[PDB]
Design a binder for this molecule. Structure first.
Ligand SMILES: Oc1cc(F)ccc1CNc1ncccc1-c1nnc[nH]1
Lengths: 246, 245
């Protein structure tokens, strides 16, 4: 019966939702810097995920309450007619927390809402989280550099957690072109999104970002600050985004 | 000439070393239970990794000093003539720590010794860590430990492999061994030499997640699912194709 080349079933009526929470500015009294370039990330993702059949829904600078309502809404709607779910965080983070406009939120409580315990329509279907989060500095196209801060957390069965940067390393954001991670993710989605198995592609993104040179830098102190992204797979089958037949 | 199907070069003279640190018993004053079945894990791994061309080196119940010496030795030998490196921990853990016989060791300092910085012969070559570690509870019974060890990343070209994720539970049959390792070794047996290693680890995720936990000998072991994960920092496809002599 058992089959090593078994794929997630990706022939439902709709591909499914892509949430994109995009944070540029923060409440004054948090003392976190503007993330100039995050809009390039939001837009580049919105395009690439649209071309793969996702209903993309972006949300700019939500407060904790607004964000929790929007994500809980999406959790309690039926995904019965959908292949999978994608959720993206473009913000600052620390440890097991992502920053909303006004406060930090436990990543576990966000992934928790799709555990299959709480969201039956997504049991056995891929739940991909993509996280571009790091430590706010707190000092035309400049390259800004943040220290890795967000833990490479796992989640539950059939989750894929995707991280801009690993412990020890550094996250880069061009203020016009956007995050190195997202640039290379979106480029690879453009070329291979609809052909390649998704973790094969994420592996390409690891190569592309690791191979970015950091020896001759505008800023002297940005030198030797490599970026290595990772992903934590709890997936149980091959994942493809083959064109849905229209 | 950038290539989406690019593989790690796996045609060096030797496959490379597999370290297996195997912990069954602990210093009394740590109050950690015997891990009855860990020998089945050690042996099953030793066999499967040997068949793939690894020079397997097992070490039973080392103290912190002995372990750090053995792993530092392996880090400072030349791996120039080798495809890759494998390191396996069968013990208890907590957070970012693995338990030696006498004390806990920071996992980061163990993976640290193979970072491109400190081990030139392994730059660009896969460094796989496999970790069967969880919280000491306190004929063939199934014992159940709560997940405790963080699913830590490492550096470029590392693959960190974990028995269990946060929230879930690790299982060990006291004769047959850990659920994780049983299914890992079975999949290595069938597909080790054909399939890309992360494809296989994905099969292991399916096999372990699908193990039923509804009708259990022990009432309180019911509804305690096991979901393993892996954190890939790999940059290329990884295969263990048979080496020709
Ligand atoms: O992965 C990292 C990224 C960083 F920027 C900094 C540190 C880590 C290592 N921490 C963890 N990794 C995975 C699960 C849990 C933790 C954890 N560390 N303390 C409490 N939980």
């Amino acid at each position: 019966m058992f089959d090593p080349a078994e794929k997630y079933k990706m022939d439902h009526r709709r591909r499914g939702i892509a949430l994109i929470f995009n944070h540029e500015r923060f409440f004054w009294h948090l003392t976190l810097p503007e993330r100039r370039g995050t809009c390039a990330d939001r837009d580049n993702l919105t395009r690439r995920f649209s071309d793969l059949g996702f209903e993309v829904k972006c949300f700019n600078d939500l407060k904790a309450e607004e964000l929790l309502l929007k994500i809980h809404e999406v959790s309690t709607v039926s995904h019965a007619d959908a292949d999978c779910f994608v959720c993206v965080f473009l913000s600052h983070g620390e440890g097991n927390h992502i920053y909303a406009y006004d406060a930090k939120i436990e990543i576990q409580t966000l992934t928790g809402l799709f555990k299959g315990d709480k969201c039956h329509s997504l049991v056995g279907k891929p739940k991909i989280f993509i996280i571009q989060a790091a430590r706010g500095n707190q000092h035309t196209n400049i390259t800004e550099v943040d220290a890795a801060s967000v833990y490479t957390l796992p989640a539950g069965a059939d989750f894929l957690m995707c991280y801009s940067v690993a412990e020890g390393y550094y996250s880069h954001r061009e203020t016009v072109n956007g995050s190195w991670y997202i640039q290379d993710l979106c480029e690879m989605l453009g070329k291979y999104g609809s052909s390649l198995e998704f973790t094969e592609l994420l592996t390409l993104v690891n190569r592309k970002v690791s191979q970015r040179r950091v020896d001759f830098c505008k800023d002297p102190s940005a030198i030797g600050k490599k970026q290595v992204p990772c992903f934590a797979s709890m997936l149980t089958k091959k994942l493809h985004f083959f064109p849905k037949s229209n």
